[PDB]
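Loading example: each entry is read as six labelled lines plus one structure line.
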Amino acid sequence: PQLERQVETIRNLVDSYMAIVNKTVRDLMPKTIMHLMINNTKEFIF
Amino acid sequence: RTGLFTPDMAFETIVKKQVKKIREPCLKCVDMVISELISTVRQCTKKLQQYPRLREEMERIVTTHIREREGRTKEQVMLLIDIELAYMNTNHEDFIG
Amino acid sequence: SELLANLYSCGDQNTLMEESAEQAQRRDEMLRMYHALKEALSIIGNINT
Amino acid sequence: GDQIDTYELSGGARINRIFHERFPFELVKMEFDEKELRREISYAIKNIHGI
Amino acid sequence: NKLQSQLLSIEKEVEEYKNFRPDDPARKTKALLQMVQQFAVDFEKRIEGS
Amino acid sequence: NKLQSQLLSIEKEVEEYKNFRPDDPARKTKALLQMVQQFAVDFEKRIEGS
């Protein structure tokens, strides 16, 4: 029936949205670590 | 020294300088949203209630809570800009990337 | 619109909402666990020094 | 500084710089089952519409 | 950190449990309103799909 | 017929007034509970759009 087309649409939209979420996680995870652990240790050392 | 190649900090410090300009509008947005939440709580309390004591107390409580939360909503906006300044990620959607 | 007033209007509200014995046991245990956790974390704080 | 080790990788600098390029590898080992997705999507649509 | 996490998980409930008194109409009526709101939300969820 | 139609819009409410007393804790309690439930439902309706 037509319901399969609806499933297809949702299947594609989730992929597209998760394509955006990964970028954000890839960009923010290293910076979250630079601010709170690496740069804090450096400033503590100096 | 002498300029054989372009330094990185010529890029990093101009970017870090322009990124710091973003703190202001981000805190404007939080103030505007708190304005709307207070407005709506006033509409709900105006419409429903004609026990003056109960409408007064209920609106005081819901607005005190929204105020105690503005103090937590604005920390994560400052901390997100700080996180934006901690590291320069040139691996995606950029000329180099 | 009407269910809450019907439930409330029945007499003996102190018996309508009585708790089962299981909840009395659960909350007594959670209180003991909470106090024991606080004491343990105090001892660790006073040992690390 | 001007004392650069040209034998190894610098240690923290490029080990961490590469931990930030192993992390993307960890994000693609997910293996989501398509069949259960399409089933739960169908049931979700029907349950959302409801009556 | 283990003990801190356990306290954080338990605190929101033991906050209420520590003040228990069996003769407390306020608790009974708050429970009544919570049960009724839960029932009306589950019912609307199953019928309307909301 | 016109009078009976008018009286129907009044009975639902005056059934509460006929037994009115200046000191009635049960009436106040159920008025509080009903008004809290009304507020929570209206607020969620205004922001969520449900």
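Chain E touches chain D at residues 47-49 (CB under 8 Å).
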